[PDB]
Write a protein that binds this ligand. Structure first.
Ligand SMILES: [Cl-]
Ligand SMILES: [Zn+2]
Ligand SMILES: [Zn+2]
Length: 259
């Protein structure tokens, strides 16, 4: 019943989240862009079985080790539909539900970073959210394929999730994400507090994830495009009139793209 969730470091700033049912000794992984950290953990736990592989989007740092892990473990590969996903067994659509290690996960189609990006949401007293590269700790992904209108709508869906929902994004972008946020709201007391907190964690080389939606709603600039201060600094940066929250968002993402 109890599910331990641990990050396996990979590449420069990637985290391969490893979901663990230590009673049945079955484990799952999210976005294994490098199969080697997973193979090492499985070798160190030979009586365990990797049962499920969960993919968010088709990018190399998330599927690089999926094919080799399936041929090694036979795990079921869950992936987004309408994207090429190596060795994918189940193509996931918006609104569908899956059961991984006994936990039911809702599938949210979240366009923006990529056109077919999905997210895994588990409802409980403390919900869990695996959103890949869509929502980051005090940030969001770059618009490699989607439009700002798509990405804003996607983040708006995730922001409506319960306040204590745990955000398991992929990358260790928090310190850089907070530095940009200070340029949007230098007078945000909560954001200033969070920046000093993440500065200590990264100085000790400790993880900054998972985050909570409530903390994101109060410090993440891309989730605060309706705020008066953010909308005012948005017009300041572009020198225009951002009439809609989507336009406020489009300026912020283009601003961080060159920040
Ligand atoms: Cl970014
Ligand atoms: Zn990506
Ligand atoms: Zn990525």
């Amino acid at each position: 019943g109890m599910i331990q969730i641990d990050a396996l470091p990979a590449f420069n700033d990637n985290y391969i989240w490893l979901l663990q049912d230590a009673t049945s000794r079955r484990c799952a992984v999210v976005d294994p862009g490098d199969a080697k950290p997973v193979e090492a953990w499985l070798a160190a736990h030979p009586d365990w079985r990797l049962s499920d592989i969960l993919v968010t989007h088709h990018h190399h740092d998330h599927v690089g080790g999926v094919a080799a892990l399936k041929e090694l473990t036979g795990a079921r590969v869950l992936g987004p539909a309408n994207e090429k996903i190596p060795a994918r067994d189940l193509a996931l659509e918006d609104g569908e539900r899956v059961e991984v290690l006994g936990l039911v996960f809702e599938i949210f189609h979240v366009p923006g970073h990529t056109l077919g990006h999905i997210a895994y949401y588990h409802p409980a007293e403390t919900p869990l959210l695996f959103c890949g590269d869509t929502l980051f700790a005090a940030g969001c992904g770059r618009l490699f394929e989607g439009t700002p209108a798509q990405m804003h709508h996607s983040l708006a869906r995730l922001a409506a999730l319960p306040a204590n929902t745990r955000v398991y994004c992929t990358h260790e972008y928090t310190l850089s994400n907070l530095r940009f946020a200070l340029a949007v709201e230098p007078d945000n007391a909560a954001l200033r507090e969070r920046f000093e907190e993440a500065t200590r964690l990264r100085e000790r080389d400790r993880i900054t994830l998972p985050s909570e939606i409530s903390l994101e709603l109060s410090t993440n600039p891309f989730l605060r495009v309706s705020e008066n201060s953010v909308k005012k600094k948005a017009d300041q940066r572009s020198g225009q009139q951002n009439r809609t929250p989507e336009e406020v968002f489009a300026v912020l993402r283009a601003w961080k793209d060159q920040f």
